[PDB]
């Protein structure tokens, strides 16, 4: 019976809530108050990257921490040299509306996607020169939000139709589809071991997936609005979510509970981009108040403000070696902070 | 040792800079429009987004139509903030209230608070039929129509019965009530009346864009 089905669902929800309560032996504040605060972390704009015409909705770092790819709404995909503020390539995309761009971990490929429901893989190490599409991935119903590379011939895409998909570029079809969300999936981050990935959607919940098994193992419900950005912790046993409720939350995968709520009465705007530092001590967050705010993940006390953008900050990512932070915002500038 | 690499890098940067300058010119030469609400408009102008290119008075317009996305719009509507105007095609023949608050949510969005909106009120023939005959649903789901009468500002170019005109301007003022309230020079919500037989919406959108860019130039060149 449908009412019996709802009763079973609510009984299971109560059981898991009771288990989570039993697993909350102590709070993060009690175990973290003893350590030294990180202090005021002030980093200046070490470099500004100009050349974009519209708001910058996506950016990504290379594995070398030296090459940078940025996606903006002018239908352009510029690959920058962060050290010498150059432009290795400028790929004109067929679809101007791009929300996600990906740099392959071994180079030679760059991905992009947006309101076209298509993830376009662009070959870099071509036989002769220039840049051309390698394969176009189609099948997603909603807009693509965040696509990240597993390796060559394997990509993971997040879409607005509540489903994430795993692809292989050579054949061109999906290997596994992920279902279980109610709202549009808005961001996606991969584990360092490339075995799991967490997706946050517009249903105020984040879910952990298994890439090959293809089912959702855990769900995390601690927010109160749409989650706009997710990011795995460097260790791989935690992640941080930013939502429209102006609260950043750190979730633990082995205790499926929220750990901290980095929030203030002053901050009303939501979080657009979230990225951890190399050690995970600092949790950089990009807000809609034309500011990026550097939190401390362990002690919820806020310890830094990256002022310098005059429009909404939408992109944020720490280098693979943790040497630079690039902040892409809606003023068509990529300021590199260090 | 690094001389050749640096020289090649600077040459590539110069080439990309020239390409980006040309793209800058072509990007500023064109205006972007969002079509929300609609097939007749895009048909008479000339996958998730259906591109449409048309040229009026030697100015390139880039209208964009969402056709493969879900009902939820609170996320992908934020990308259409730099567009010149959001073309809202209301039916205005209970779809009326849904269109009314789609317009309200567009109006009061903190990212569309600077983006102008063009209203069209697409249905006119069936509006005339519904006000001429039938059960008169216009007053059932909008009881204020009984008190409301034909405004004096109205110019009755089609000399039809007063009922269709008064209902049409009643819907228009219902939209303008939320357009004007909590609304200043950032946008204006240019209201228009259209239908299938209309073959001049291109000129209306063109003039609306002219006014929008005129206001932007006034704000930008300290002429206000």
């Amino acid at each position, epitope marked *: 019976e449908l009412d019996q089905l709802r009763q079973e669902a609510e009984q299971l929800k109560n059981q898991i809530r009771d288990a989570r309560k039993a697993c909350a032996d102590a709070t993060l504040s009690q175990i973290t108050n003893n350590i030294d605060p990180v202090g005021r972390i002030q980093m200046r704009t070490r470099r500004t990257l100009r050349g974009h015409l519209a708001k910058i909705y996506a950016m990504h770092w290379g594995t070398d921490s030296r090459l940078l790819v940025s996606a903006s709404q002018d239908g352009k995909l510029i690959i920058w040299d962060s050290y010498t503020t150059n432009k290795v390539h400028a790929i004109p995309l067929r679809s101007s509306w791009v929300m996600t761009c990906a740099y392959a971990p071994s180079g030679n490929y760059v991905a992009c996607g947006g309101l076209d429901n298509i993830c376009s893989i662009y070959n870099l190490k071509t036989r002769e020169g220039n840049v051309r599409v390698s394969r176009e991935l189609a099948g997603h119903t909603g807009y693509l939000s965040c696509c990240r590379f597993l390796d060559d011939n394997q990509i993971v895409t997040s879409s607005g139709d509540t489903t994430c998909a795993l692809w292989d570029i050579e054949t061109g079809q999906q290997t596994t589809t992920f279902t279980g969300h*109610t709202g549009d999936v808005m961001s996606l981050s991969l584990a360092p071991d490339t075995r799991l990935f967490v997706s946050g959607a*517009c249903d105020a919940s984040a879910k952990l997936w298994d890439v090959r098994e293809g089912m959702c193992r855990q769900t995390f419900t601690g927010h109160e609005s749409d989650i706009n950005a997710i990011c795995f912790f460097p260790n791989g046993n935690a992640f941080a979510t930013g939502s429209d409720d102006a609260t950043c939350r750190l979730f633990d995968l082995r205790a499926d509970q929220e750990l901290m709520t980095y929030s203030h009465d002053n901050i009303i705007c939501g979080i657009t981009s979230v990225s951890f530092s190399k050690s995970g001590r600092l949790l950089l967050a990009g807000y809609d108040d034309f500011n990026c705010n550097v939190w401390d993940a362990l002690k919820a006390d806020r310890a830094g403000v990256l002022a310098g953008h005059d429009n909404r900050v939408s992109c944020l990512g720490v280098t693979d070696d943790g040497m630079a932070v690039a902040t892409g915002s809606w003023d068509s500038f990529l300021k590199i902070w260090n | 040792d690094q001389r050749n690499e640096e020289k090649a890098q600077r040459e590539a940067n110069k080439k990309i800079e020239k390409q980006l300058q040309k793209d800058k010119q072509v990007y500023r030469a064109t205006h972007r429009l969002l079509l929300l609400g609609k097939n007749t408009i895009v048909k008479q102008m000339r996958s998730g987004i259906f591109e449409t290119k048309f040229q009026v008075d030697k100015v390139n317009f880039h209208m964009f139509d969402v056709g493969a996305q879900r*009902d939820e719009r*609170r996320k992908w509507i934020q990308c259409f903030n730099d567009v010149t105007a959001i073309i809202f095609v209301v039916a205005s023949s209970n779809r009326l209230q849904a269109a009314l608050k789609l317009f309200d949510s567009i109006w*009061n969005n903190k990212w569309l608070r600077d983006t102008s909106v063009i209203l069209f009120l697409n249905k006119q023939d069936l509006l005339a039929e519904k006000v001429l005959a039938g059960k008169s649903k216009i007053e*059932d789901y*909008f*009881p204020e129509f009984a008190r409301y009468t034909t405004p004096e500002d109205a110019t009755p170019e089609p000399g039809e019965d007063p009922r269709v005109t008064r209902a049409k301007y009643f819907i228009r003022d219902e939209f303008l009530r939320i357009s004007t309230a909590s609304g200043d020079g950032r946008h204006y919500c240019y209201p228009h009346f259209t239908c299938a037989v209309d073959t001049e919406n291109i000129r209306r959108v063109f003039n609306d864009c002219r006014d929008i860019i005129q206001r932007m130039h006034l704000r930008q060149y300290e002429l206000l």
Partner: nanobody
């Protein structure tokens, strides 16, 4: 977890004055433009009544103008809608929807087919 558990229901003849509220939990109940959406038999989700964060800009649809009154008890986390002089026009399941974002004045997606912050309704036959 966001939850909007409705309460109330029961058959009434035309002119009935039955009512009951929601049981909203999981959020602050003070920064949201909550409203009411009812699905008619064989009809999509439409809106009837709306209230602001504090309870100032109370707006109604035409069919409910002068019939039902919206109430928002902040300290009691209940959208305490009162249905007076009910008519056999509604005969719908009522959902206490919530604004998608806090500290904002736009309910962009409230009447969609699927929506996270809507909750399970209660059928009010009439």
């Amino acid at each position: 977890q966001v939850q909007l558990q409705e309460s109330g229901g029961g058959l009434v003849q035309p002119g009935g004055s039955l009512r009951l509220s929601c049981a909203a939990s999981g959020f602050t109940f003070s920064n949201y433009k909550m409203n009411w959406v009812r699905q008619a038999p064989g009809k999509g989700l439409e809106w009837v009544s709306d209230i602001s964060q504090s309870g100032a800009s109370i707006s109604y649809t035409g069919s409910v103008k002068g019939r039902f009154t919206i109430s928002r008890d902040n300290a009691k986390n209940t959208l305490y809608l009162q249905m007076n002089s009910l008519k056999p026009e509604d005969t719908a399941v009522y959902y206490c929807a919530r604004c998608p974002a806090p500290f904002t004045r736009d309910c962009f997606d409230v009447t969609s087919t699927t929506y996270a912050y809507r909750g399970q309704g209660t059928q009010v036959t009439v």
